[PDB]
Design an enzyme around this catalytic site. Structure first.
Site, PDB file in Angstrom:
ATOM      1  N   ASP A 181      -3.785  38.494  10.099  1.00  0.00           N
ATOM      2  CA  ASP A 181      -2.276  38.309   9.472  1.00  0.00           C
ATOM      3  C   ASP A 181      -1.441  39.070  10.428  1.00  0.00           C
ATOM      4  O   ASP A 181      -0.256  38.745  10.434  1.00  0.00           O
ATOM      5  CB  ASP A 181      -2.438  38.801   8.209  1.00  0.00           C
ATOM      6  N   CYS A 215       1.042  26.521  16.148  1.00  0.00           N
ATOM      7  CA  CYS A 215       0.812  27.574  15.285  1.00  0.00           C
ATOM      8  C   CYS A 215       1.990  27.479  14.438  1.00  0.00           C
ATOM      9  O   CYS A 215       2.160  26.272  13.771  1.00  0.00           O
ATOM     10  CB  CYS A 215       0.717  28.872  16.119  1.00  0.00           C
ATOM     11  N   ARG A 221       1.135  32.288  19.240  1.00  0.00           N
ATOM     12  CA  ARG A 221      -0.253  32.120  19.514  1.00  0.00           C
ATOM     13  C   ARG A 221      -0.622  30.821  20.293  1.00  0.00           C
ATOM     14  O   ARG A 221      -1.630  30.542  21.006  1.00  0.00           O
ATOM     15  CB  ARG A 221      -1.144  31.797  17.876  1.00  0.00           C
ATOM     16  N   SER A 222       0.259  29.789  20.078  1.00  0.00           N
ATOM     17  CA  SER A 222       0.280  28.544  21.026  1.00  0.00           C
ATOM     18  C   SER A 222       0.214  28.911  22.531  1.00  0.00           C
ATOM     19  O   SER A 222      -0.345  28.443  23.491  1.00  0.00           O
ATOM     20  CB  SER A 222       1.105  27.580  20.640  1.00  0.00           C
ATOM     21  N   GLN A 262       5.196  35.983  22.159  1.00  0.00           N
ATOM     22  CA  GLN A 262       6.023  36.513  21.153  1.00  0.00           C
ATOM     23  C   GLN A 262       5.991  38.032  21.074  1.00  0.00           C
ATOM     24  O   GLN A 262       6.974  38.617  20.784  1.00  0.00           O
ATOM     25  CB  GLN A 262       6.104  35.966  20.143  1.00  0.00           C
TER      26      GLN A 262
HETATM   27 CL   LIG Z   1       1.609  31.830  13.686  1.00  0.00          CL
HETATM   28 CL   LIG Z   2      10.838  35.674  24.116  1.00  0.00          CL
END
Ligand SMILES: [Cl-]
Ligand SMILES: [Cl-]
Ligand SMILES: [Cl-]
Length: 280
Positions: A181, A215, A221-222, A262
């Protein structure tokens, strides 16, 4: 080993945030005019994540060709990926239209449909064999044929039918079901096992269209998945595997879709995955 020596130095000096922000400062910036048209507002999950015009996937539909999806063409690795957001309740037909039109064999999913109450993607494939789905807008039928549920991920065999022509295709759904999470997995072992299973399935073969990776936004995540997979391909292809510069690979991928990786934790996790996978 050089990438590992760099990793130990970055960890020691605590410089993950600085390295990551350097990447963000250098990243490409290209227009996303189509994603920002008013009529496409409800095709975007997040107002601040859009596909660039130059690399967006176009739907072959007369009324609106737009889907929030980008073609990442890694020329040296000789592998292409489609990175997309998790489909919305109103874009599930678009999503499978894209899979059909692009001749993809595999779909890679890196999130749960709901995480901490937040809807990260619609339920766009059938959970039960006996309750197939029909996407009336794009005239596609999708049936669950079987699934193999493992501790960290599930692989599903789906049948995608074009109802106009009655042609059917087998799609493999590779669902990493246990990303935490908050933050990143403590260890990359399960993620690497998953990444190798996708590659072993044949879904990435140049005989098929690009694998589709998603994702929530299609960038975090991708991004980790695409980055690790490309880096491990390059190590297997080149004569000097120590020559693979993960930051350079990531800046290359960011020419095709904004925002890939990210957080600084996702960057550190990508390094871990590539270092450990390189050892295989
Ligand atoms: Cl995500
Ligand atoms: Cl960014
Ligand atoms: Cl408009």
């Amino acid at each position: 080993m050089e990438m590992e020596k760099e990793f130990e130095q970055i960890d020691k000096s605590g410089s993950w945030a600085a390295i990551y922000q350097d990447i963000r400062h250098e990243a490409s910036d290209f227009p996303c005019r189509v994603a920002k048209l008013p009529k496409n507002k409800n095709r975007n999950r997040y107002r601040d994540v859009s596909p660039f015009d130059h690399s967006r996937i176009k739907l072959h539909q007369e009324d609106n060709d737009y889907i929030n999806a980008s073609l990442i063409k890694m020329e040296e690795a000789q592998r292409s990926y489609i990175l997309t957001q998790g489909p919305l309740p109103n874009t599930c037909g678009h999503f499978w239209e894209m899979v059909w039109e692009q001749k993809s064999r595999g779909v890679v999913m890196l999130n749960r449909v709901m995480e901490k109450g937040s809807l990260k993607c619609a339920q766009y494939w059938p959970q039960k064999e006996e309750k197939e789905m029909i996407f009336e807008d794009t005239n596609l039928k999708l049936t669950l044929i079987s699934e193999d549920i493992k501790s960290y991920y599930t692989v599903r065999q789906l049948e995608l039918e074009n109802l106009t022509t009655q042609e059917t295709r087998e799609i493999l759904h590779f669902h990493y079901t246990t990303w935490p999470d908050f933050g990143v997995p403590e260890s990359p072992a399960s993620f690497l096992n998953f990444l190798f299973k996708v590659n072993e399935s044949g879904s990435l073969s140049p005989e098929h269209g690009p694998v589709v990776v998603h994702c929530s936004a299609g960038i975090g995540r991708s991004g980790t998945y695409c980055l690790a997979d490309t880096c491990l391909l390059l190590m297997d292809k080149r004569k000097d595997p120590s020559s693979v510069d993960i930051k350079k690979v990531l800046l290359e991928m960011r020419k095709f879709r904004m925002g890939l990786i990210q957080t600084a934790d996702q960057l550190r996790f990508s390094y871990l995955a590539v270092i450990e996978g390189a050892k295989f």
